[PDB]
Amino acid sequence: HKVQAVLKQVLKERIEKQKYDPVKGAQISKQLADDLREKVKALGYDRYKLVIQVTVGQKQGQAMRIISRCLWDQTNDNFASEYYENESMYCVCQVYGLYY
């Protein structure tokens, strides 16, 4: 998806040259979440809303997955997932494109 691609662009544009940090992380994660919200609430808003989830993790290499089971109004609610990793930061995003 174009919007998903540009949300992953936003993810990199936040987290490039970076590493996951416990001390920077409260403000870093607030910036992450707010910036993805500002992405989806920019041009591309047409009487919709986005529901957001973000996970940020250190690199250890164990067995981890994601899943999410919901009940939604079907024709108006959509979803997508994004995964990424780098030298030290794993980052996952979950986007819920819903009609406002």
Binding site: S29, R37, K49, V51, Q53, A63, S68, R69, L71, W72
Partner: protein, 97 residues
């Protein structure tokens, strides 16, 4: 409204232990259980239900959710649970019709 959800969660996965291949499955059953918890209240709204479950492995975390909605009719309710090895989060979102 959410206290019965919390009691349901503490009934279902109280003091239990991690097993990864059915972890999603527990989430599904929880989502179905919470679905019945929504279906018991059946307030004429658009409902969203979500769960999260994660091993207690020693990495510090922070979590919440936000949107940009009609502030008087659209809302959020939540239950956090934990045990020796797991963390559980259940979230319900109201949007009006």
């Amino acid at each position: 409204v959410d206290t019965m959800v919390r009691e349901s969660i503490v009934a279902a996965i109280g003091d239990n232990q991690f097993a990864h291949n059915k972890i999603d499955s527990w989430s599904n059953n929880i989502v179905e259980g919470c679905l019945k918890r929504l279906a018991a209240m059946n307030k004429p709204f658009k409902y969203i239900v979500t769960t999260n479950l994660t091993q207690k492995a020693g990495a510090g975390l922070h979590a919440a959710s936000c949107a940009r909605w009609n502030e008087k009719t659209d809302g959020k309710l939540t239950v956090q649970w934990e045990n020796n090895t797991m963390i559980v989060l259940v979230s319900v979102y109201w949007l009006a019709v």
